[PDB]
């Protein structure tokens, strides 16, 4: 809900990217963990991995807060202004309005 | 009031003409009467003009109904459409609308 009143003029095809961006960032943190989990120096067989790491089982908040910094509105202000000018080029009761019938 | 809901898209400078048109038509009927009032044939001095004619002491309805037939809208539909497009080129809350404050 905080993402709602922060992204005002974003199109629907744009905030479907920032969740794919935060997904991509969390996969980057997961493979980052799995490239150093097997990189154990003085790898003792004692104290086995019966407790798993499980570093990122879901998207955290700072993944969103980092992926949100690359947000970008696709449509400009000049094209939403173009479609509003097309809505008024369309009629939408282009005329009198608010009349009544004789008794 | 019947002239109101009959002249819809007339400008204010246009129905100030049709009352000058009905005035001009009633003056035409008044001088029409005064060009035949003094044109009495077999003009007897008996039965004097102690009762005046007074043919048109005000504008009648058919003066309006005849002058209304030469009504003409000055502004077109393309220029009222131009000013509405200028109203939307103007902002008039060109944006979000309808937000609230946190509790």
Q: Judge whether A2 and A68 are in contact, CB under 8 Å.
A: no
For the domain that residue B31 is a member of, what is the CATH number? 1.10.8.60
Residue A84 belongs to some domain of the structure: no
As a whole number of angstroms, the distance between CA B97 and CA A77 comes to 16
Provide the domain limits for residue B54: 1-75
Overall domain count for chain B: 1
**Residue B17, number of CB atoms within 10 A of its CB:** 17
Q: Is B45 left (phi over 0), alpha (psi -120 to 50) or beta?
A: alpha
Residue A100 belongs to some domain of the structure: no
Residue with tokens 């019938």: A101
Q: Does A93 touch chain B (CB under 8 A)?
A: no
What determination technique applies here? Answer: cryo-EM
Residue B102 belongs to some domain of the structure: no
Q: Judge whether B8 and A96 are in contact, CB under 8 Å.
A: yes
Q: Does A5 touch chain B (CB under 8 A)?
A: yes
Residue with tokens 């044939």: B41
> Exposed, middle or buried by CB within 10 Å (0-12, 13-18, 19+), for A67?
buried
Residue B97 belongs to some domain of the structure: no
Q: For chain B, what's the residue count?
A: 103
Q: What is the nearest CA distance from B88 to chain A, expressed in angstroms?
A: 7
Q: Judge whether A37 and A71 are in contact, CB under 8 Å.
A: no
Q: Judge whether B35 and B55 are in contact, CB under 8 Å.
A: no
* Chain B residues lying within 8 Å of A9, measured CB to CB: 95-96
Residue B13 belongs to some domain of the structure: yes
Resolution to one decimal, Å = 3.9
Phi, psi (rounded to 5 degrees) for A11 = -80, 165
Q: Judge whether B99 and A5 are in contact, CB under 8 Å.
A: yes
The three-state secondary structure class of B21 is helix
């Amino acid at each position: 809900e905080f993402l709602a009143k922060m992204t005002n003029g974003f199109s629907g095809a744009d905030l479907t990217e920032i969740c794919q961006r935060a997904c991509k960032l969390a996969i980057r943190e997961s493979i980052e963990s799995e490239i150093r989990r097997e990189r154990e120096r003085q790898t003792n067989p004692s104290a086995m991995e019966v407790e798993e790491d499980d570093p990122v089982p879901e998207i955290r908040r700072d993944h969103f807060e980092e992926a949100m910094r690359f947000a970008r509105r696709s449509v400009s202000d000049n094209d939403i202004r173009k479609y509003e000018m097309f809505a008024q080029t369309l009629q939408q009761s282009r005329g009198f309005g608010s009349f009544r019938f004789p008794s």
